[PDB]
Design a protein around this nucleic acid. Structure first.
Lengths: 209, 56, 127, 71, 123, 114
RNA sequence: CCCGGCGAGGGGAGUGAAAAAGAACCUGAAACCGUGUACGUACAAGCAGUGGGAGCACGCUUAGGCGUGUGACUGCGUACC
RNA sequence: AGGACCGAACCGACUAAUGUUGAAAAAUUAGCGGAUGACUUGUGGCUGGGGGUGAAAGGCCAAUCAAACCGGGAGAUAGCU
RNA sequence: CACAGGUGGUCAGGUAGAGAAUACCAAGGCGCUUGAGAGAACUCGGGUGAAGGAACUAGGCAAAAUGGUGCCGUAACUUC
RNA sequence: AAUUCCUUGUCGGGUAAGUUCCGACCUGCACGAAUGGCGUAAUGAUGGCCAGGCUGUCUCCACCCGAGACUCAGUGAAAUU
RNA sequence: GAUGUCGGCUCAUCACAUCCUGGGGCUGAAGUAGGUCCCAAGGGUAUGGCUGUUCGCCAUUUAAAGUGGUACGCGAGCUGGGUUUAGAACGUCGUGAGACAGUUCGGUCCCUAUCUGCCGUGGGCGCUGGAGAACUGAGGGGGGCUGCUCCUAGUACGAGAGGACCGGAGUGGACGCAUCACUGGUGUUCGGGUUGUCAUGCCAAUGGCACUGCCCGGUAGCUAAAUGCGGAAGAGAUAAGUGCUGAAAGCAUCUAAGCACGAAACUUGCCCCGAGAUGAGUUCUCCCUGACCCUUUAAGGGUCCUGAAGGAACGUUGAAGACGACGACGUUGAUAGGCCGGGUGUGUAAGCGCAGCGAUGCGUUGAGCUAACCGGUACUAAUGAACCGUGAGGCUUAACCUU
């Protein structure tokens, strides 16, 4: 089963009857407007192409415009597609919204990664800050040696060094849905959504057992 | 640091290849005149969207 | 990085940023037209437009404030009496920055600054 | 035959089962068996680029009309 | 406590003046404590008619933190200093019969029916 | 959408008594406890501005006796029973921080008058 | 006489046997940096050399499988003191 | 009165941060001690290299000191590289 | 070297303050010449910290912290 | 012991603790009366130990400003080979 | 003609002869528990003191305090502290100079990254016309730990006390990732208070400057000391091991044929980058259907006419970031500043009236002033031209177009 492309829009410490407060993150649910709903009638391919959103989209290219023109006609924000399960999909006017979260207790959450600039040396990997004293040679902060000696004579792959994030996804996996609330369209999730505020996301129902 | 040997002159040229001065992709003229431009900035006659700039 | 921010600190400490902006704005109200760097030209726009806002109507406190941020006598006489009724009829955009080109002495990207209704201007040269 | 390699990560020698070579990329049992019979680096890449196996018994040189060969 | 060592104030009629934290309890590979943590104290002073004497090693609990304390609504009760009432070193509940200084409203449970219901101050 | 920072104003309650810094007040609350529902009070001086949308709270400092304690009671909390305004005292500051160590006759400010 | 700030530097016009003698001027290497041509560099690797060589320009190939220069590609292969 | 003191101006540099292909002849910035004295110190002068001069470090003796500088001996010598 | 180095004499205005400490300042000198921009790591300079209080390190340690005058009250040791 | 081959001696004390520090013992290193001894006030930019003031040195790190790095413009080195 | 040493941190990496969970035999093992005991690199694996220092001693955490290598990891990182210690001096020895693997006092490492690796990023080319959009998985890593008690279960078994695992479960601890509402932190782009001189002609008032002058509060952002939280059901191939059916050896036997079962490792499942996968992918969405001169012509060269879809420079600039790229987007425009409604800050704006012995306070004013965030407003600045991109785009078998 597919995901809902949300928007990160709100964070609230909300009260409950029992004198306990819950920090929560608030995702505004939009309905999926289908493009073509591609299926495995044609090739070995199986995924459903969805636009949950819109833009003024006065500067877009014709290959992007005819794509919204055959869809739900909403000058779309962009093109997201999703792998699917449990048989082929109902292909027109389908309008997947708050109902997806009606039986889902826990969600995966697939982010747009985290948009923290440079992130990079020392900070991103939470390393120690070298001594700020003792006349340490042109050095008040350093990450630490990335190899060993001539015997391997190299730096091994996968070491935590430097760089920007590259803004991939980052999935927390299996964090709780507190509630879903229809007609107001609020999905309260208990954990955080990746990125700064105002970001886009995918919140997709959990994969994991 | 230092270096091992004095390096070959093909190396010195590969090393500069991305740092070379890059093409301007042609030039601008005004949409509404035969006065020459400076692209998406204002000329010596104030010309872009009229008024006046740069009375030197 | 700089996420979910705006505006600018340019080249120095608060006192210098204040003193420079006083110099440059004090010069604006008397000369009508100036040239500076594009980040700097924006901070100038953002300094002068709130001084005009106080000045639309006479009001002794709004005259005191205008004398407090730029403590020069040439601007507070120009404000309110001359310059108050002029910009009275707009609600923001009393001035525009015109992106004039690069700086001759080095290259720092530059804008000419020019009042919204400015059409009378010296034709004398600048360096 | 567990195909020992050390691409760049994590403690241990690494491996892949004999079952991987048939369940996934099903050619691969014959491929990295004829691979080791070709010379050093570059020439052995130039020899190689003529072999194909596919997933098996779904082959796509129908139009060329292939010469059959018995071993 | 929050650093290794850390001297804090005595909060019961068991001893006198100040006492030194030797370890944090309620985990390991810890450098820092949460608010709801159980502390390990040594007594560096004591009082001749208290429950204890100098250099006896005990278990204890926080009654004030200068940083402040929280749990149910996440709102803090923030205090003027760190302070600790000693527990029994194996059989639980406080050792002292009196509290000295303020208290939290998070200690209001079956296992403290002795120590938050006292009259002397901050009831 | 338009919801960002707007959801703090939407949640914010309106049946809330008016306030100025140094206002004394009393928070009555429950103890909750193991088998019995009983109530209890705290009075003193409010040392800080409130208004935090939903997160708005009375930050009372008691500072009457003993060593200083600040208590934060959240206005929207279901276990908060009743709120009297009482006396309206002056400070000419947003905050009262200089009175932290003094507990003797510091939480008893006067009505401010004209 | 042309260009440029009154500049620096060069060219044209004109001088001489000669400026491929232009004022630091004698003819003039090599290092030195750059142009122009040929042909090369994106299934692509190590003393860059040796052996085999598609291809391509020029040489009436005297066409008699060659000469010249370059050279995809690749067997083999560890500088001098 | 004072081989006294806190302390500029005036002089030094115990320690600390920095510098270390520095601005630097350890300077800078901060803690610090001499300055009512065996202190700080301008001018003119003098002793010449295992020799001077030393409240002592085998200190300092023309941007330099457990061996100054130059001119001759001098192509020292080398059993050695 | 227009070296953040070294270097004798003379004259002596203001508020607070013990004064020629030290923030500013009257007459006066004078901008120790790259600039503007980025709100990147980081390097150097400069600023701040919950709670702790050197626990960092061979080592408190420059940032930060002491500092002035009026007055009470004043220890073990002392050649006072 | 600013002294101990063994040894980080023994015991008490400080102490979250104690190879250091301080006191007592001799089972005494090679202690021991002018490279002087016992003992002492004053004085030091003078050593170790302790708790308290205080502090981003640190636990444990976050953020701001500026010159470099970096961006744009100018000029344009060096260890090395 | 320099292969240069000790211990610790930061940062590591590789071998398993495994500290521990886990699966299994034996037992002088009833069960439990322990003694004995094999498979297993997957994962977690504590802190302060004194000493130059690993080891020590002592106080201490947890279920726990591992094994081995790495110029005996890591001075073109750190302490360079010890080790050489030149000076001094203790202790010691000799006529003496000077010494000590006895000792006490402070006191110096320098290298801007050329080739190479690593991580992050762009440029050039190619997937067969071009362009733009989603995307599959050949490939290769991330996560993988582990206490607690409830149930399971007071039951088999044992004289009696007692008495376990798998599975469901909540929850702690370590580890990993995001995050900024909560709680702190900072916030030289916001407010206020205040010392001094200098200043606004002068005062009441107010302002340049003094490290952001000093001092107290501070939005949004960012951030751990605060916040949420996975660590998985299931599958195969098995290991040690219990066998059945059965031979070598008429039988017996875990084995050899044969078949049920048997661990977190391993193939995975859960997570992520990924078609340069040249064996170059599918699928979606847009657009271009003119001509001659010449030569080696699946073609290339040259030219008139003529170039769409799209791109880039350029531009303001961002919820994206070194630069780029990515992204909003250039009057079709909320991009950014002003400006208006709203979030959230501060502490009562100059003047005036009034009271007072004046400083000063109080009514006008719950004032005024106000930053990043959110929505509006075209008020304002982004000529919005030209240009690079072209006229439907290979051979050959098979299948198709009268073929």
């Amino acid at each position: 089963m597919i995901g809902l492309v949300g928007k990160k829009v709100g964070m609230t410490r909300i009260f409950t009857e029992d004198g306990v407060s819950i920090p929560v993150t608030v995702i505004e649910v939009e309905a999926n407007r289908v493009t073509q709903v591609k299926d495995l009638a044609n090739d070995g391919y199986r995924a459903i192409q969805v636009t949950t959103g819109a833009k003024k989209a006065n500067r877009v290219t014709k290959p992007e415009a005819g794509h919204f023109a055959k869809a739900g006609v909403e000058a779309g924000r962009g093109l997201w597609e999703f792998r699917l399960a449990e048989g082929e999909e109902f292909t027109v006017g389908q309008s997947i919204s708050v109902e997806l979260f009606a039986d889902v207790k826990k969600v995966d959450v697939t982010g747009t990664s985290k948009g923290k600039g440079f992130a990079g040396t020392v900070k991103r990997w939470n390393f120690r800050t070298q001594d700020a004293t003792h006349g340490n040679s042109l050095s008040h902060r350093v990450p630490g040696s990335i190899g060993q000696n001539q015997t391997p004579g190299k730096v091994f792959k996968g070491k935590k060094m430097a760089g920007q994030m590259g803004n991939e996804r980052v999935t927390v996996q299996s964090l709780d849905v507190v509630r879903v609330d229809a007609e107001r369209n609020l999905l309260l999730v208990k954990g955080a959504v990746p990125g700064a505020t105002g970001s886009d996301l995918i919140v997709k129902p959990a994969v994991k057992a | 640091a230092v270096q091992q040997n004095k390096p070959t002159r093909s190396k010195r040229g590969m090393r500069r290849s991305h740092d070379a001065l890059t093409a301007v992709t042609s030039l601008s003229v005004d949409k509404t005149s035969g006065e020459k431009h400076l692209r998406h900035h204002i000329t010596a006659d104030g010309y872009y969207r009229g008024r006046k700039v740069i009375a030197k | 990085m700089r996420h979910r921010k705006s505006g600018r600190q340019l080249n120095r400490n608060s006192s210098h940023r204040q003193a420079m902006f006083r110099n440059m704005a004090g010069s604006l109200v008397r000369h009508e037209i100036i040239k500076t760097t594009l980040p700097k030209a924006k901070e100038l726009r953002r300094v002068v437009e709130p001084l005009i806002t106080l000045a639309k109507t006479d009001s002794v406190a709004n005259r005191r404030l205008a004398f407090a941020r730029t403590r020069d006598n040439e601007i507070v006489a120009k404000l309110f009496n001359e310059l108050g009724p002029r910009f009275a009829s707009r609600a923001g955009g009393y001035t525009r920055i015109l992106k004039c080109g690069f700086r001759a002495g080095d290259n720092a990207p530059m804008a000419y600054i020019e009042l919204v209704d400015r059409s009378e201007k010296a034709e004398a040269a600048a360096e | 035959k567990v195909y020992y390699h050390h691409t760049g990560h994590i403690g241990g020698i690494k491996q892949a089962t004999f079952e991987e070579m048939i369940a996934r990329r099903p050619e691969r049992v014959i491929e990295i068996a004829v691979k080791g019979m070709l010379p050093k680096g570059p020439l052995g890449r130039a020899m190689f680029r003529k072999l194909k196996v596919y997933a098996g018994n779904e082959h796509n040189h129908a139009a060329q009309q292939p010469q059959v060969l018995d071993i | 406590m929050i650093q290794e060592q850390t001297m804090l104030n005595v909060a019961d009629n068991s001893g006198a003046r100040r006492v030194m934290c030797i370890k944090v309890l309620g985990g390991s590979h810890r450098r820092y404590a949460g608010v709801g943590d159980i502390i390990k104290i040594t007594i560096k002073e004591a009082i001749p008619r208290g429950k204890v004497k100098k250099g006896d090693v005990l278990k204890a609990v926080v009654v004030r933190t200068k940083k402040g304390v929280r749990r149910p609504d996440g709102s803090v009760i923030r205090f003027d200093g760190n302070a600790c009432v000693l527990l029994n070193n194996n059989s639980e509940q406080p050792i002292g019969t009196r509290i000295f200084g303020p208290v939290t409203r998070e200690l209001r449970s079956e296992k403290f029916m002795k120590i938050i219901s006292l009259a002397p101050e901050v009831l | 959408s338009n919801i960002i920072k707007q959801l703090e104003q939407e949640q914010m309650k309106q049946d809330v008594p008016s306030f100025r810094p140094g206002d004394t007040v009393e928070v009555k609350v429950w103890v909750v406890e193991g088998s019995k529902k009983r109530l209890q009070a705290f009075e003193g001086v409010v040392i800080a501005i409130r208004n935090r949308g939903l997160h708005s709270a009375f930050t009372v400092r008691k500072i009457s006796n003993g060593e200083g304690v600040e208590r934060v009671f959240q206005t929207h909390s279901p276990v908060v029973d009743s709120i009297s305004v009482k006396r309206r005292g002056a400070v000419r500051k947003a905050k009262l921080y200089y009175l932290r160590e003094r507990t003797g006759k510091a939480a008893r400010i006067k009505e401010r008058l004209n």
